[PDB]
Amino acid sequence: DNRIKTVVILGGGTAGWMTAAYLGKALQNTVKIVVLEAPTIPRIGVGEATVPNLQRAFFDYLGIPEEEWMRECNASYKMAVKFINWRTPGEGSPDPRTLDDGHTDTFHHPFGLLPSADQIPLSHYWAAKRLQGETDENFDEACFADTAIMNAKKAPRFLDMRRATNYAWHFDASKVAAFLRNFAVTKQAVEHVEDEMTEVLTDERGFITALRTKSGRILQGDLFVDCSGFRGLLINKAMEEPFIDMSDHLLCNSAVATAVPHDDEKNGVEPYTSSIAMEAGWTWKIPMLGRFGSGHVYSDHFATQDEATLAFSKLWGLDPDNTEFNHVRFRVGRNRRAWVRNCVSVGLASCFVEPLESSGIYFIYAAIHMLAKHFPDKTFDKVLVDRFNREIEEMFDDTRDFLQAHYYFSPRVDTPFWRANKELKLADSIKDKVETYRAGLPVNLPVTDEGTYYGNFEAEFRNFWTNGSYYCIFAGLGLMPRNPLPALAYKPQSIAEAELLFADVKRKGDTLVESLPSTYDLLRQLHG
Amino acid sequence: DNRIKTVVILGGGTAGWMTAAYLGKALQNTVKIVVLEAPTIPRIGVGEATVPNLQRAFFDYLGIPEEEWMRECNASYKMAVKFINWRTPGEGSPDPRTLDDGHTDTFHHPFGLLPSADQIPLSHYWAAKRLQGETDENFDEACFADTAIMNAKKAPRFLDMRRATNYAWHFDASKVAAFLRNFAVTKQAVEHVEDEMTEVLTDERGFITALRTKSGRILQGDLFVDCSGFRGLLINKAMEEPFIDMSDHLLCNSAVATAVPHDDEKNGVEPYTSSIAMEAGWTWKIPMLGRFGSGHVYSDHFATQDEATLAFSKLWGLDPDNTEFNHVRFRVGRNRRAWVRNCVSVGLASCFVEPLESSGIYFIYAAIHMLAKHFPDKTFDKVLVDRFNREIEEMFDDTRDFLQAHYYFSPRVDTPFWRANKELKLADSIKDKVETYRAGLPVNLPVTDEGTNFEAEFRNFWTNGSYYCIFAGLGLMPRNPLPALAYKPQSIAEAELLFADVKRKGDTLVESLPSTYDLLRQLHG
Ligand SMILES: Cc1cc2nc3c(=O)[nH]c(=O)nc-3n(C[C@H](O)[C@H](O)[C@H](O)COP(=O)(O)OP(=O)(O)OC[C@H]3O[C@@H](n4cnc5c(N)ncnc54)[C@H](O)[C@@H]3O)c2cc1C
Ligand SMILES: Nc1ncnc2c1ncn2[C@@H]1O[C@H](COP(=O)(O)O)[C@@H](O)[C@H]1O
Ligand SMILES: N[C@@H](Cc1c[nH]c2ccccc12)C(=O)O
């Protein structure tokens, strides 16, 4: 018996309690699990966004049904991230400005895979038409019915809870952490120790043997999960693993956030996250029932905390001296290695990027999934650790590259921030992908039906940013292929097939924008 | 109108006629297609085994249903490649030798994809039991009902044609090329020109403009497909593109082949390809109705042509001086680039590896699929050509590295051939994959029911199950089980029901299925 007997998880919040819960189920009560978290000085619920795999891959694995957790964390629905004013210059504003060509400066990044005709994705058929003047429709409205639905602020389920489209979740992070702590302690025999860590005890090889708490108590274990946040108390401090700062790729490194009460009966609820462009960065809007979480993400090299706070308060008509603000100064990048010896970093202690494409919780889920799959015995095979490291390296870097694209291919150059983005070098992987897009070829072509994509995580993980996500962002910012896909010139029967799929998206959007309840109405059913 | 108007295809083998037919349908009669083949310069005349995606990724695109083409080219079923005597020393023989551990030296590489429990494929649950002396079963018989079925020589369909398992196809190459020529000419308005090519006409930029025939005829076109075989009359000769010799990775570079008539009433028909190991290489056996195709693949650096021919004749009880033999001297590797300017290499002109895992025709439909997707206009965008080149590079490498595995991890050391195999330079890709397998981790985990689509099975075609079939078949095992299994007793238990399900299915189906012979006699009746 050479197995791990005890796992110690430093830190609660979302990372620690997702880790505790997933491992509880994965390790089938053959391993003792201890969470050590300091006492929680509660901080205002700024809202967090998720991706659609979360219910299948996490809550369903734990047997927690969707309604049960949503009702305990004031959860709303999310059908896309909506980008507002990313192409036009000037101060932030909730309202979209107007382009030269007369279009409103908004584009959606919805969920799901694009349909195909003669194995060519709908993206390419729309591009042909748009380059050739045959259409004035935007990519998002042409190719996703969800675009029509989000414009009408309708819900992604009918009131009897039949599904209409794909969706993910908005919620208060700390309420989810609490729902999960309580799940893990009552139903999974996790030991909750509320205290500070003061010492990390290590052997001759530098493997951790226990953590000392402030009350003097010593927690022995065989594997340690650093969920300590940015401080990286195990992975960076004790293990001495270097962080790789990646501000050479993204410039934002601060936020100022808050909750804003909201007339849900007057305005309706948006079933989506909004990325509202500002002078020195951007601002999230995450609708929940009653309120919305918002935060101005900025660079401190292009705005002071004051400059940012004023601009952010101006946005929403808030009083700066009578408004409760959280001020984060995050690090952007990842550990050289996520897992050193017997210390596995998960969450902010592992890696971070601005929450521009709802990456935070997915990064946590991806790591714990990958920890369960590569779970070690006490010999800590170096290949096991290496492969875990490789999965996290690629997951992170590919998503950094994807985020850089949002900035490098913004046409905005008014403020020194937006111009500064154009002076960064693009990574080789994303240059190669732009070269491909520009010749009209698909990038990251989905090779699987949506059922398998959102059913089997391993399938989604091999192809997280698909063709449709590249087209949503490139075409949304106004980068287009140089020309259509040449094969379309030879395929009039295929062009015609695509015209029926464009029709099918119109029919669905029309039919559903009529029959669906408002987002507000579904929430009011759910939480009452 | 900046589009290609005319496409000329040099060579009317399996490559040429697959190309003509696919493009006919893909290009929707907007483009004139010409095949130029000399009926006197024979096709290589081999190309007999296939992989299971052939029907989806080709005949379904053409709207030809499976029965229609099988009945016209004397097709049999294939449920695996069966490796005979790959672990034991001495002269070739159709009959399997006996291992030290007392079992016969045979392992299968079947196609039927592996069930999972708690997201871990059945491969890993078998490996746990075998490494912990808790099972005596080999991987193939534990994890695939196909193994039971091939041992009983039963068919992979019932007589009412309901499917039993996954499978690929055996057939006569020349009958397929004929059924395809005739499809392409009658239903797709392709022009068949029976004549020899004598000169390749080129502009100042080095693009081909036409091909000159011996009868003085000039075939103009804007895009050329070199299906000329190993000669590479357009891609290598005219375009001056170098072939990248890869005998640093595989040592076989010759074959000697023939058909053997076969008592199908006496023996039954084997629903599988046999890879029978020899002293200086190996020998394929490819059952069809009435006959079986065979050929000794060898290195000429470790056997002379006579050495090989004698050994091959010995195998089957053939008379060397009164038996009709085909003698190929193939090249192993790929063009530095498959597509140069306006010349696209497809088939033996593009790339090749020994027919150990029936990769030849898959390479053809992969390339044509990729040509249709990257099809150019007259501007010949450099990015389009580069990406086409990249997909052929990776397709090839993925299959080469998989093949190298069969050799580097053979335990045989009797003849200087088998010992030479242990001095191969392994590619980085296959070293990394062995390192992974050895830690007990899955290699190229399939993420899908086989419900899912040609595109699905293409950059990592060779799945977990295929690596386990070969590694574990030759006796390379993980160092230890997958550690996560130590913590998952409920999962271990679930797997015990899947092992039971493969037993029940093999038993139930070895009873209820018709013999391979009997299904063929219904099909070709
Ligand atoms: C030993 C061996 C075993 C194989 N086994 C398998 C297997 O089991 N399974 C599998 O899937 N694949 C296998 N393959 C690969 C497969 O056989 C081929 O991919 C396919 O059958 C034919 O390739 P091709 O048509 O490119 O070439 P070829 O058949 O060589 O075609 C050459 C063509 O060029 C024409 N030509 C040449 N010069 C001229 C000219 N001047 N004018 C006009 N025409 C000209 C010839 O007339 C002919 O039509 C094997 C290959 C070899 C060598
Ligand atoms: N020294 C520590 N001892 C115990 N818990 C800690 C320590 N440092 C951070 N944490 C916990 O780590 C989690 C993430 O911290 P933060 O990112 O600052 O919210 C919280 O639950 C903290 O209480
Ligand atoms: N694989 C993700 C990709 C995605 C699409 N739209 C998004 C919006 C935000 C975050 C991720 C996404 C999904 O389909 O769910």
Describe the structure.
Chain A: The active site is at residue 78. Two copies of one chain form a homodimer. Chain A has 528 residues and is of the alpha+beta class. Chain A has a single domain (1-528), classed as FAD/NAD(P)-binding domain (3-Layer(bba) Sandwich), CATH 3.50.50. The first copy, chain A, is 38% helix and 19% strand. Chain A contains 19 helices and 24 strands. In chain A, strand 7 and strand 8 form a beta hairpin. The radius of gyration of chain A is 23 Å and the shape is globular. Chains A and B meet through helix 12, helix 14 and helix 18 of A and helix 11, helix 13 and helix 15 of B.
Summary keywords:
globular; 19 helices; binds tryptophan; FAD/NAD(P)-binding domain; FAD/NAD-bd_sf (chain B); six-stranded mixed beta sheet; EC 1.14.19.59 (chain B); binds adenosine monophosphate; nucleotide-binding (chain B); 24 strands; seven-stranded mixed beta sheet; alpha+beta; binds flavin-adenine dinucleotide; homodimer
